[PDB]
């Protein structure tokens, strides 16, 4: 097992204010595969200057997915207070074939800082966090969302300049507001920009430290880190699992400006992932310097046959969900003539 640093010495957990109605929004970003939304590139091949049909894992055309948003926490002036989160931890979902994620799509536009609904700001990309595992249950106080045995956690850190991936047993700590203590509402992560995101030295452990206040990590088989540099370019992230382990996908390395998803990591996770949840994050900003953080959208993958159109340089710029309707199915027919198919 790997060392992930000592246990948190913090006596209690930061209090967490759950107010789902403040996170109920109508911000639709449905899958449009004609724009190659949510496309994992064929994993074992490359294609170029050609139109094919291909059996892969894809989201449904038009699927709205599940929207998630992170918010600045409570504050009075320069003093951050309670965290402010949605009810995501108690909403455990089926992993099935995995999923893909639209990240940062609203960045640069104007949005709300959520905690103060009428306060507006320029929207900034924020990365999502996930808890995934084999079996789930309830915390001591009866709340849902506890992952048992070894659990995969994907957690951004360093103010969005790294993604952490680790596989540990999560032992809920017993302090005040912790998942095995009094007055528990939800776990969450946080960072504090005034001390964690100073220009010179970002705190690359701030989010992990916050997580370790809610859970003690035990018998970690791995702790991986992947560097990210700062920009506001939207991205796609995907995850699947085969016998080879858990596969992480991103557009950042290979198709930063186009969105196609390519594998960048394979995690030694061989117990079947059956469940996942979204880990709420709350930013401990001062009241006067709150930001608007772009919602991300999660879409489940399904075994589907897609038409895939590859540009000359080899990237997918157009797709069709063959099974979406009869007209779409004709595009994927080698006899119809609506497309020139290989
Ligand atoms: N903090 C924060 N995060 C955000 O992501 C955010 N996003 C918005 C804006 N979100 C959206 C998203 C989609 C549409 C939109 O134009 N949707 C179409 C329908 C698209 C379809 O269903 O095909 C529409 O006409 O409403 C508008 C605003 C505003 N404040 C925010 N604030
Ligand atoms: C910070 O994170 C790294 C990478 O996971 C870990 O090795 C280290 O022990 C952590 N430091 C502390 C003080 O927890
Ligand atoms: C790509 O295919 C088109 C359509 O057949 C053709 O006109 C074009 O010359 C091809 N480009 C290259 C670089 O092969
Ligand atoms: C979270 O969602 C569950 C399921 O709908 C519900 O029973 C629970 O009361 C919710 N908690 C909060 C704080 O909204
Ligand atoms: C966990 O809590 C939910 C909500 O009350 C309940 O329906 C479910 O039966 C509980 N599971 C166990 C194993 O007690
Ligand atoms: C987690 O694993 C241990 C040992 O492998 C087992 O005793 C325990 O029952 C497991 N968790 C649950 C909720 O069963
Ligand atoms: C961690 O592993 C050791 C040896 O495999 C085992 O004795 C111990 O019980 C494990 N810890 C937990 C919390 O299961
Ligand atoms: C990742 O970032 C850290 C901190 O800036 C740096 O020390 C390390 O060399 C970087 N790794 C890569 C592969 O760029
Ligand atoms: C936001 O603006 C930057 C700089 O102009 C650009 O690189 C990025 O693609 C934009 N992001 C979105 C989601 O429009």
From TrEMBL:
Signal peptide: none annotated. Residues 1-334 form the BetaCoV S1-NTD domain. It is found in: Virion membrane; Host endoplasmic reticulum-Golgi intermediate compartment membrane; Host cell membrane. It comes from the Viruses. The cytoplasmic Cys-rich domain is palmitoylated. Spike glycoprotein is digested within host endosomes. Specific enzymatic cleavages in vivo yield mature proteins. The precursor is processed into S1 and S2 by host cell furin or another cellular protease to yield the mature S1 and S2 proteins. Additionally, a second cleavage leads to the release of a fusion peptide after viral attachment to host cell receptor. Homotrimer; each monomer consists of a S1 and a S2 subunit. The resulting peplomers protrude from the virus surface as spikes. Spike protein S2: mediates fusion of the virion and cellular membranes by acting as a class I viral fusion protein. Under the current model, the protein has at least three conformational states: pre-fusion native state, pre-hairpin intermediate state, and post-fusion hairpin state. During viral and target cell membrane fusion, the coiled coil regions (heptad repeats) assume a trimer-of-hairpins structure, positioning the fusion peptide in close proximity to the C-terminal region of the ectodomain. Spike protein S1: attaches the virion to the cell membrane by interacting with host receptor, initiating the infection. Belongs to the betacoronaviruses spike protein family. Fusion peptide 1 (FP1) and fusion peptide 2 (FP2) function cooperatively and have a membrane-ordering effect on lipid headgroups and shallow hydrophobic regions of target bilayers. They are considered as two domains of an extended, bipartite FP. The membrane-ordering activity is calcium-dependent and also dependent on correct folding, which is maintained by an internal disulfide bond in FP2. This is Spike glycoprotein. The gene is S.
């Amino acid at each position: 097992y790997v060392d992930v640093g000592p246990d948190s010495v913090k006596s209690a957990c930061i209090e967490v204010d759950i107010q789902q109605t403040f996170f109920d929004k109508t911000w639709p970003r449905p899958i449009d595969v004609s724009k190659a939304d949510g496309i994992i590139y064929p994993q074992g091949r490359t294609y170029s200057n050609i139109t094919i049909t291909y059996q892969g894992l894809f989201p449904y055309q038009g699927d709205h997915g599940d929207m998630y948003v992170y918010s600045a926490g409570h504050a009075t002036g320069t003093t951050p207070q309670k965290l402010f989160v949605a009810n995501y931890s108690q909403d455990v979902k089926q992993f099935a074939n995995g999923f893909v994620v639209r990240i940062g799509a609203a960045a640069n536009s104007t949005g709300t800082v959520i905690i103060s609904p009428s306060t507006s700001a320029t929207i900034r990309k924020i990365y999502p966090a996930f808890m995934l595992g084999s079996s789930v249950g309830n915390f001591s106080d009866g709340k849902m969302g506890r992952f048992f045995n070894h659990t995969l956690v994907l957690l951004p850190d360093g103010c969005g300049t790294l993604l952490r991936a680790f596989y540990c047993i999560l032992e809920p700590r017993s302090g005040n507001h912790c998942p095995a203590g009094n007055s528990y509402t939800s776990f969450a992560t946080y960072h504090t920009p005034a001390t964690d995101c100073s220009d010179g030295n970002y705190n690359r452990n701030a989010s992990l430290n916050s997580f370790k206040e809610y859970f003690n990590l035990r018998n970690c088989t791995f702790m991986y880190t992947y560097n990210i540099t700062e920009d506001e370019i939207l991205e796609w992230f995907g995850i699947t699992q085969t016998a080879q382990g858990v596969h992480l996908f991103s557009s950042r390395y290979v198709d930063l400006y186009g969105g196609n998803m390519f594998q960048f990591a394979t995690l030694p996770v061989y117990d079947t992932i059956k469940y996942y949840s979204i880990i709420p994050h709350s930013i401990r900003s001062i009241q006067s310097d709150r930001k608007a953080w772009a919602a991300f959208y999660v879409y489940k993958l399904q075994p589907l046959t897609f038409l895939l159109d590859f540009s000359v340089d080899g990237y997918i710029r157009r797709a069709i969900d063959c099974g979406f309707n009869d007209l779409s199915q004709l595009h994927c027919s080698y006899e119809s003539g609506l497309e020139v198919l290989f």
